[PDB]
Design a protein around this ligand. Structure first.
Ligand SMILES: CCNC(=O)c1n[nH]c(-c2cc(Cl)c(O)cc2O)c1N1CCNCC1
Length: 208
């Protein structure tokens, strides 16, 4: 059923640095998420170039944004390659330990946090606005899993006999009391227009 994993020390440190460092420009989280989705869609597209069956689990490659003012979530869905359980345990497909190192040094030499994605650990910026992050993922070569954490040095993984998804990744953000602007139509379109206007895949913003 539910396995529990400790973050490597370095991720745990990045996460804490992200949660505590005073830093106003929290909007970038959306850009790192959308850009992760796009990377993952590149990958299923690439793979399909040589094997068309790769797309049997769905041929539309797209990114939806789904706010929910009632649950206080913002969900980013994509029809990318997805991750296996191994990928979810191994820092969500990232090279997060070396990447946290280069980010740490960079930060001490005058990066700011908005530059997190140049170090390959953009996922973690989700913790700028979310108290808890659940990732659901289905890869063609594995079953559906949900990865979850509220930081604090640990994460969980479990099989998701929830809503089958076909193929993709779904990042539900459970937003902090004071970051509900990220749930407003007006405010999301603005961030997508500003940081994510040249993404090679349709982005749909759902309405409620
Ligand atoms: C090994 C093949 N799978 C993937 O690469 C993958 N599948 N889904 C994602 C993904 C990860 C995050 Cl954090 C996200 O917000 C969206 C994604 O699609 C993936 N990424 C995106 C790039 N960083 C590594 C994990």
């Amino acid at each position: 059923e539910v396995e529990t994993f400790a973050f490597q020390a370095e991720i745990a440190q990045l996460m804490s640095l992200i949660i505590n460092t005073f830093y106003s420009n929290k909007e970038i989280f959306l850009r790192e998420l959308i850009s992760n989705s796009s990377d993952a869609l590149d990958k299923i597209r690439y793979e399909t170039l040589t094997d068309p069956s790769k797309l049997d689990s769905g041929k539309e490659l797209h990114i939806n944004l789904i706010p929910n003012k009632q649950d206080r979530t913002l969900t980013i869905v994509d029809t990318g390659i997805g991750m296996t359980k191994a990928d979810l345990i191994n820092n969500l497909g990232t090279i997060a330990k070396s990447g946290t190192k280069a980010f740490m040094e960079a930060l001490q030499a005058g990066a700011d946090i908005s530059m997190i994605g140049q170090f390959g650990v953009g996922f973690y910026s989700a913790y700028l606005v979310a108290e808890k992050v659940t990732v659901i993922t289905k890869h063609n070569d594995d079953e559906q899993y949900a990865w979850e954490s509220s930081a604090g040095g640990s994460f969980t993984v479990r099989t998701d006999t929830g809503e089958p998804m076909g193929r993709g990744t779904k990042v539900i953000l459970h937003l902090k009391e004071d970051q509900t602007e990220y749930l407003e139509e007006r405010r999301i379109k603005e961030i997508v227009k500003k940081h994510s206007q040249f993404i090679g895949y349709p982005i749909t913003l759902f309405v409620e």
